[PDB]
């Protein structure tokens, strides 16, 4: 039972990262300025913290490490994931 109950809102990606940070105990390296201020797909509900990442980032087409505390997405632009 490993998961929370999320609080995400669903305007701009910087918002609902840092929001999930605080949240969730957990830090989240992004560029505010190379998210052309996207929307977030607000996942508000009870869920596990990798869990949820993929859920959010999916549609973006961006790679979230998740190691720790330490949650990096990245651009990786390759249609190879390992």
Known sequence: ???????????????ALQALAKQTDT???????DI??????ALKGRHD???SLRILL?????????????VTVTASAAAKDG
């Open 49 to 51: 913290l990798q869990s």
């Open 1 to 15: 039972s490993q998961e929370w109950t999320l609080d995400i809102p669903a305007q701009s990606m910087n918002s």
């Open 27 to 33: 830090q989240l390296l992004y560029s505010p300025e």
């Open 36 to 41: 052309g201020g996207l929307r977030s797909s």
């Open 58 to 70: 999916q549609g973006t087409g961006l790679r979230y490490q998740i190691d720790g505390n330490t």
